[PDB]
């Protein structure tokens, strides 16, 4: 159940390509994509911790996570 989880530098947006994503992996939940390792690494917050975040949140943690 639920997406497939893939390490950080794999999911990137731009920083690391554009849509080279592995299998199963989109833009629109890239932030979701990632571990419990990935994203407490990239972001520093709970994956249930962005859904409840902030639209401007959001944005600048995918944003400086290299995932926007």
Same mark, same amino acid.
């Given at each position: 159940? /639920?997406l497939q989880?893939y390490?950080? !530098?794999m999911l990137?947006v731009? %920083?690391? /390509? *554009?849509?080279k994503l592995?299998? /199963?992996?989109?833009?629109? *939940? +890239? !932030?979701r994509? +990632?571990?419990?390792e990935d994203?407490? *690494?990239?972001? &520093?917050?709970?994956?249930? !911790?962005? /859904?409840k @975040? &902030? @639209?401007w949140?959001r %944005?600048? +943690?995918?944003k400086? &996570?290299e995932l926007?």
């Amino acid at each position: 159940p /639920g997406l497939q989880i893939y390490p950080y !530098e794999m999911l990137v947006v731009t %920083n690391k /390509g *554009r849509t080279k994503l592995p299998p /199963g992996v989109d833009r629109m *939940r +890239l !932030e979701r994509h +990632l571990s419990a390792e990935d994203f407490s *690494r990239v972001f &520093a917050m709970s994956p249930e !911790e962005f /859904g409840k @975040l &902030a @639209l401007w949140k959001r %944005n600048e +943690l995918k944003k400086k &996570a290299e995932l926007f």
